[PDB]
């Protein structure tokens, strides 16, 4: 039985002490968190998702901090370190001045109006980026690969990642909102080397098909996706027992191949040389196709065959008795199975429903593959937010101090009770401008002062704090940039958490 | 320690003090363990059995320590004992007081490496002047008196009271027969206690002495092939079974008839294969016995674990229990098989003589085994003292008279050099001094009365202490010119191995 301010302050003390070490983990210059296991194990990370899952939390508000980090992780995966930083000082600064005065609902609606004023200010500060220029996309990826500070061959993986996500931009909800990255697929290769690879059309497959079971190479013939009914007929048109007897062998087998050859004649109408079958696939059905001069494929998961259907832009047929070129294998299509290393890798290019290209990476080992991949994993996060919003916001304290001022004149204009949470959120925005001064090592009281002074003149349009040089730098000149969409949802999550724990005054069993 | 890490058992106090303090306490019982002794050490064991002894190698194996500095040095005392005989009493007591002097240099502020290299220069220079302190040699190892002259010091290092009769008797039991030109038995010298016929009636019996009573008649020939078996013969008794006390006694009679004809053929097949003596590590069967008398084959009623393994070594046999009719895979070696009554006990005597392949075994007769198993400890290092592997053993002054002969040289050598190694050479001459200081405190006088004289006599080689009045008041005892000798080699390793141990244990701080 828990109630009152003590739940509220316990919500404060838990959410604050989480964000303390993790804001030192912020910045490309950061401070690693140390985690001593009781077995003596050591964790030295900055990424809060590995942090929050490893640490032991006893307050369910601290468990809810993981849940809003699970919220940001499942939508993006990045900024999960940053969503918990902003949510601390929202409830740290405003609450105890006002919950000694005890108005929960007013601070909720103050948290409402802190959100939309930030939204318009995002459109004030963000100039649009080119979604038709690689170099406009390049420097923002270069801002992301230097976070882990890996540019061995991640720099050439910048162009591989942008030529995947910009290509796979196709996603509808009635107004074509595209925030997809699952339509892209990386190639996980132990052989070859990264640099003489490039993006290929369609959606490339590495997950199950690693063998030339399709053909060796295909120029003209189409791909066939089969979720249709390929279960053979045991009786005349009946489902009797299967072959387990010589008496069951002679009668039934004549009608077993009879169901299959009708399907095979329907498929040869579009002239393939490759047919993959997933649902209803039988052992006899995929080897009369061997007699029908088509090498047939099974044992593939469904998410492969969503990619393979997007590798050709065709609809997977549920009609068994008629197949067309306008049903499976849209257009001519291309299928290329070549040797990279020792294994023969299936590429499916020439995607009709065009603009579909995926990632081809190949390390000299799997470890050499995996290190470049994580940088390209962060890179495909960024371009997906570029597809989500084609405007770029300056990094550092340029975005934060600009919004931190606009709440103040909003607080002077509205000048109700909500004016006091605005200035509190205005200071809650500055903690990432605060923590970069420890992420560099400079005097924090002077740099926050001069960043206010640059808002007086320059309005902090592109002059924010750098935790790399400790000075208030042009984000145009230094190339520290990020999309508006990743900035908004990071702030949107921190608004959601601050409203959440403000409702929490009782924790009972 | 400031942190959760760093598990260690040594440090600033513990390495300086407690490592040396642990080596002090092990050397504390060895203050009177070499040379003349009034000191005795009762031990109850891990076997929890009452024994008194004066050999530290018996004591230190009963002793356990967690201090690795204290643990390491007793292995080096074994390394001298593996090489030469007695003097394993000396290795601990020399290095023990050596390290106590090293604390005093660490009291002053000397670096440990200055103390490390200081005794090393002193170890080399002493080993140079030490063969110049060779005063005699075993010119005739066939002589009984020249052999007994060496042995009186090592027996004194167990007990002063039995040094003279045993040193003759060991030479009477002939370690003299070895030319020592690569000839030394290590297990065909194995001392055989015969209970009864008290300790001055201890005797001589060359070749392998077996206390076990000779059963049956004597061998057909003394040139017999020796069959050494682990348990060929058995003896029957049983108790209640799974269903109690089995349903008949007919199969008990049926099993008893084949048992006699089994051991009838076992003595027969040994008689057929050429062996005319059987060695039974198990007990004797009655049905086996009365066919062995007609076959004229000598039998041993029982043997222990040590009896078979010496026979598998010396004769060259293989020990296995014969549940089959035995054949000869044992190749009898000894050409003379005797029965003797030693201590009025039927004693199996095997015998052969070769130039560098002879056998000559110590036998002891005493009315108490618990006395005689410590008397053999005076014999154990004394026989290995003959293993210098040379005829002329380069005999040095016995008793410890070489120590004051050395200590005059070393502190003179320590004065001439410069350095901070300079002091540890002078402390090294003090390490010779501590042993006769500890022995004279068992003699019955103070050390400063004694040690003043042995420095004041001169380079002499003769002047030392025993356990007499001449040891006490004048501190002059002819421990060179009265049948008291030591060899060069036992003195050479015991200084060497005590040095390398003490230098090793001084560097460690963990």
């Amino acid at each position: 039985r828990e109630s009152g301010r003590k739940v509220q302050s316990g919500n404060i003390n838990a959410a604050k002490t989480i964000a303390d070490i993790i804001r030192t983990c912020l910045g490309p210059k950061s401070m690693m968190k140390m985690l001593l296991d009781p077995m003596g194990g050591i964790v030295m990370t900055n990424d809060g998702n590995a942090i929050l899952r490893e640490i032991q939390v006893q307050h369910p508000a601290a468990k809810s901090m993981i849940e809003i980090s699970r919220t940001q992780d499942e939508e993006v995966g990045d900024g999960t370190t940053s969503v918990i930083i902003l949510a601390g000082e929202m409830l740290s600064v405003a609450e105890h001045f006002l919950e000694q005065q005890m108005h929960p609902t007013v601070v909720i609606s103050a948290y409402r109006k802190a959100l939309d004023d930030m939204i318009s200010t995002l459109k004030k500060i963000s100039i649009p980026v080119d979604i038709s220029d690689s170099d406009m996309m390049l420097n923002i990826i270069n801002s992301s690969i230097t976070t882990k500070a890996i540019s061995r061959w991640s720099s050439l993986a910048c162009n591989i990642a942008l030529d995947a996500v910009k290509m796979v931009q196709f996603e509808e909800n009635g107004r074509k909102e595209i925030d997809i990255k699952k339509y892209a697929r990386v190639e996980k290769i132990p052989g070859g080397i990264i640099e003489d690879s490039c993006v290929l059309r369609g959606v490339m497959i590495n997950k199950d098909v690693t063998h030339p079971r399709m053909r060796r190479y295909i120029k003209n013939p189409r791909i066939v996706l089969l979720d249709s009914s390929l279960e053979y007929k045991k009786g005349e048109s009946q489902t009797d027992i299967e072959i387990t007897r010589e008496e069951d062998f002679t009668r039934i087998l004549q009608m077993e191949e009879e169901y299959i050859q009708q399907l095979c004649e329907d498929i040869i109408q579009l002239k393939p040389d490759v047919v993959i079958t997933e649902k209803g696939i039988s052992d006899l059905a995929q080897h009369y196709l061997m007699r029908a001069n088509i090498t047939a494929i099974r044992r593939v998961r469904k998410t492969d065959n969503n990619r393979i259907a997007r590798a050709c832009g065709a609809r997977i047929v549920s009609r068994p008795e008629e197949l067309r070129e306008d049903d499976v294998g849209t257009g001519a299509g291309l299928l290329e199975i070549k040797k990279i290393g020792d294994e023969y890798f299936t590429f499916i290019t020439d995607c009709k429903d065009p603009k579909a290209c995926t990632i081809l990476l190949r390390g000299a080992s799997k470890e050499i593959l995996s290190e470049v991949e994580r940088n390209l994993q962060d890179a495909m996060q960024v371009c997906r937010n570029v597809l989500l919003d084609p405007q770029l916001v300056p990094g550092g304290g340029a975005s934060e101090m600009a919004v931190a001022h606009a709440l103040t004149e909003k607080s002077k204009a509205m000048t109700g009770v909500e004016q006091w949470p605005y200035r509190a959120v205005a200071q809650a925005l500055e903690v990432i401008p605060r923590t970069l001064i420890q992420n560099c090592g400079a005097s924090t009281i002077r740099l926050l002062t001069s960043l206010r002074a640059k808002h007086t003149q320059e309005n902090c349009e592109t002059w924010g704090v750098n935790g790399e040089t400790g000075t208030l730098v042009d984000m145009k000149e230094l190339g520290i940039w990020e999309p508006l969409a990743v900035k908004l949802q990071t702030y949107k999550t921190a608004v959601e958490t601050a409203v959440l724990l403000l409702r929490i005054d009782d924790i009972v069993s | 320690m400031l942190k959760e890490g760093a598990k260690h058992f040594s440090g600033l106090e513990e390495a300086v003090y407690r490592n040396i303090q642990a080596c002090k306490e092990l050397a504390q019982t060895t203050r009177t363990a070499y040379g003349p002794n009034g000191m005795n050490k009762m031990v109850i064991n891990h076997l929890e059995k009452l024994f008194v002894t004066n050999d530290a190698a018996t004591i230190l194996r009963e002793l356990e320590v967690q201090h690795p500095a204290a643990k390491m040095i007793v292995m080096a005392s074994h390394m001298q004992e593996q090489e030469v005989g007695d003097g394993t009493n000396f290795v601990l007591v020399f290095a023990g007081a050596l390290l106590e002097l090293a604390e005093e240099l660490l009291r002053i502020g000397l670096s440990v490496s200055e103390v490390i290299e200081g005794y090393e220069i002193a170890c080399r220079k002493a080993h140079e002047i030490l063969p110049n302190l060779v005063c005699c040699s075993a010119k005739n190892l066939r002589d009984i008196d020249e052999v007994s002259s060496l042995l009186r010091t090592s027996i004194m290092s167990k007990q002063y009271g039995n040094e003279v009769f045993l040193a003759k008797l060991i030479a009477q039991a002939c370690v003299s027969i070895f030319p020592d030109s690569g000839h030394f038995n290590v297990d065909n010298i194995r001392v055989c206690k015969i209970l009864g016929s008290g300790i001055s009636s201890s005797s001589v019996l060359h070749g392998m002495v077996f206390k076990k009573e000779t059963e049956g008649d004597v061998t057909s020939v003394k040139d017999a092939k020796i069959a050494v078996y682990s348990c060929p013969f058995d003896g029957m008794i049983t108790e209640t079974k799974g269903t109690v006390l089995i349903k008949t006694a007919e199969e008990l009679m049926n099993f008893s008839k084949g048992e006699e004809n089994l051991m009838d053929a076992q003595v027969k097949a040994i008689a057929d294969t050429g062996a005319n003596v059987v060695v039974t590590g198990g007990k004797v069967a009655d049905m086996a016995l009365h066919y062995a008398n007609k076959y004229n084959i000598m039998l041993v009623r029982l043997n222990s674990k040590w009896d078979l393994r010496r026979l598998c070594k010396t004769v060259g046999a293989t020990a296995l229990p014969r549940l089959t009719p035995p054949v000869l895979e044992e190749m009898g070696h000894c050409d003379s098989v005797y029965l003797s009554e030693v201590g009025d006990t039927q004693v199996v005597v095997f015998k052969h003589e070769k130039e560098d392949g002879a056998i000559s075994t110590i036998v002891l007769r005493g009315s108490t085994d618990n006395l005689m198993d410590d008397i053999e400890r005076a014999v154990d290092d004394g026989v290995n003292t003959f293993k210098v592997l040379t005829r002329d053993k380069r005999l040095v002054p016995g008793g410890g008279a070489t120590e004051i002969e050395l200590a005059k040289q070393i502190t003179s050598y320590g004065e001439t050099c410069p350095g901070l190694e300079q002091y540890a050479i002078k402390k090294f001459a003090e390490a010779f001094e501590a042993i006769p200081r500890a022995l004279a405190e068992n003699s019955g006088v103070k050390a400063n009365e004694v040690i003043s004289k042995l420095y004041a006599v001169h380079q002499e080689g003769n002047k030392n202490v025993g356990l007499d009045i001449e040891a006490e008041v004048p501190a002059v005892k002819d421990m060179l010119e009265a049948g008291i000798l030591d060899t060069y080699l036992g003195k050479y390793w015991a200084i060497k191995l005590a040095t390398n141990a003490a230098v090793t244990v001084l560097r460690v701080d963990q």
Binding site: - | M42, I44, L50, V65
Partner: protein, 73 residues
């Protein structure tokens, strides 16, 4: 492995050997103040001499065991 040395070890052996000599001091005489000896046996045992009583003692001092073994000899 335990050990005790020196004079405080040695005097401890002496007074241990005194107490068993305090017992038998006039047992060759017919007289004294009797001890019937009951052990985990649970049985009544008297004697007229000390040597039978010395066969009954499980000595706890090994130095005092030596004086037993000479006297038993």
């Amino acid at each position: 492995t335990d050990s005790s040395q020196g004079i405080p070890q040695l005097v401890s052996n002496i007074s241990a050997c005194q107490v068993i000599a305090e017992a038998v001091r006039t047992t060759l005489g017919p007289r004294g103040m009797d001890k019937l000896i009951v052990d985990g046996r649970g049985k009544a045992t008297i004697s007229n001499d000390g040597a039978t009583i010395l066969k009954l003692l499980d000595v706890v001092h090994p130095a005092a065991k030596t004086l037993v073994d000479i006297a038993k000899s």
